[PDB]
């Protein structure tokens, strides 16, 4: 059972200050779970501070007082740069884990973590690196986003060893420092965003399985917009074909879509891309649908806004989705004022089905509707109340405090305050509405969230941030009372 269960705080740790001699200065900027372990293996994450990579294993415990977190490796970057970015790859010959770390010097350091060794360095960027992402379709392909305003795509495959830069995303798509890069599941589309307030989608060509003397240069994104947000953008992800992004000063994570974009369609080529012909258009797209009453059809649709209060003027704060077949998709993000927020996306759909049914029943039976919790069948509740009364099955998680109940003690419907509270959390009808978190957990101290990670099976969520602190939330625990 327990598919509806959301996480709770289980463990926290403070890793020693490692930057005060080189604002309070120490931060965990990144955390990433190793994704290539066999099903069921204990989950492993790397947390990246300005100077160290802290590699931890999580094991579920029966003892509430026991420590599920063990630190199995600790690497110091003994150079003179601050790091802020990581991703995982694998050695193409040994299949051993590779941890990629980058920061303000502008090189990607690739570490053999099990042996505690530098495997190689990726050199080429002209400024600091702010983000790294590994391709889901190919674990040897890594994208880096930089202050040089470009994205470089690298291959760790042996055939590209002499010249590991396979692609540069350049031209004039971006004009300022990049903060975020993300791959589509198919490995052929890349999202990028930063200080210029532009979110770009790029289509990558197939990279040959041989030595490339030069990278393939892409001059134009296939979709471009500075219109979704009104501020710098510091975190971009795909959610299937949909897009999630956040900007500074807004207190939201925006779910939106590119009109006409489907990853089932063939991958467009470089010369299908639009070009900025009119400097007054702040959105352009190859994907645009041809049928609309507007002369220039809408190129994107804002779908929903997750409310993320009290981020203030803070930026460099990233959210993360747990998205695995057979489990509920969960969004997690920590703000700049000591809270962690969770949304279970599968609640939306059940709530929607429940209010459609409740609305139908109210119209058909003149408000004579009795709701009964799921977990008594529909058929047998209908016998009990008779054929004059509508019966609606309500999800068990949907807990009380479409028209409201006539009076407080009526047997039909719910109070206005019940309905409002539910709507705040679950109603998706307003693209510029604010969706309250399904769960909001307080953090002791003053904590700014930098990054969130989920274990492969979704039982752990690790949030990292300032003061080199890590917060480890759990669900489906084995703890005995």
């Amino acid at each position: 059972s327990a598919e509806w269960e959301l996480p709770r705080l289980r463990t926290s740790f403070i890793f020693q200050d490692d930057y005060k001699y080189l604002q309070d200065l120490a931060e965990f900027f990144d955390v990433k779970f190793y994704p290539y372990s066999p099903p069921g293996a204990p989950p492993v994450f790397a947390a990246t501070s300005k100077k160290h990579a802290v590699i931890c294993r999580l094991t579920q415990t029966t003892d509430k007082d026991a420590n599920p977190c063990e630190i199995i490796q600790l690497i110091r970057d003994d150079g003179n740069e601050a790091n802020c970015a990581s991703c995982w790859s694998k050695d193409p010959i040994t299949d051993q884990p590779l941890l990629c770390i980058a920061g303000n010097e502008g090189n990607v350091k690739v570490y053999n973590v099990t042996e505690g060794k530098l495997y190689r360095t990726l050199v080429g960027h002209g400024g600091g690196i702010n983000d790294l992402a590994t391709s889901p379709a190919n674990p040897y392909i890594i994208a880096s986003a930089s202050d040089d305003t470009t994205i470089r795509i690298w291959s760790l495959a042996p055939e590209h060893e002499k010249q590991p830069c396979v692609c540069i995303l350049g031209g004039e798509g971006h004009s300022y420092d990049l903060l975020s890069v993300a791959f589509h599941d198919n490995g052929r589309y890349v999202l990028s965003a930063g200080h210029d307030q532009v979110i770009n989608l790029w289509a990558l060509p197939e990279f040959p399985n041989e030595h490339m003397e030069i990278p393939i240069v892409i001059y134009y994104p296939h979709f471009s917009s500075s219109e979704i947000h009104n501020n710098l953008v510091d975190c971009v992800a795909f959610y299937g074909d949909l897009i999630l992004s956040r900007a500074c000063h807004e207190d939201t994570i925006v779910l939106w879509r590119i009109e006409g974009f489907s990853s089932d369609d063939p991958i467009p080529g470089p010369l299908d891309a639009p070009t900025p012909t009119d400097m007054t258009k702040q959105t352009r797209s190859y994907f645009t649908p041809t049928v609309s009453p507007q002369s220039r059809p809408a190129m994107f649709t804002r779908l929903a806004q997750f409310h993320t209060p009290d981020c203030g003027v803070q930026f460099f704060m990233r959210f993360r989705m747990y998205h695995v077949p057979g489990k509920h998709p969960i969004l997690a993000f920590a703000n700049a004022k000591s809270k962690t927020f969770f949304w279970d996306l599968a609640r939306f759909g059940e709530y929607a089905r429940f209010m459609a049914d409740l609305k139908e029943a109210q119209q058909s039976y003149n408000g004579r509707v009795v709701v009964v919790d799921q977990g008594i069948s529909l058929a047998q509740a209908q016998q009990v109340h008779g054929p004059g009364v509508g019966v609606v099955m309500k999800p068990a998680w949907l807990v009380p405090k479409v028209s409201a109940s006539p009076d407080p003690d009526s047997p039909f419907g719910f109070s206005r305050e019940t309905l409002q509270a539910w709507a705040d959390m679950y109603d998706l009808s307003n693209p510029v509405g604010l969706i309250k978190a399904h769960r909001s957990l307080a953090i002791d101290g003053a904590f700014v969230g930098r990054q969130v990670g989920w274990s492969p099976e979704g039982e752990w969520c690790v949030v990292v941030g300032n003061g080199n602190r890590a917060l480890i939330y759990q669900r489906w625990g084995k703890e005995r009372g």
Binding site: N231, H249, Q314, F315, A446
Partner: peptide, 8 residues
Amino acid sequence: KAARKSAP
């Protein structure tokens, strides 16, 4: 007014 990357 101005955006900030570091913790307050």
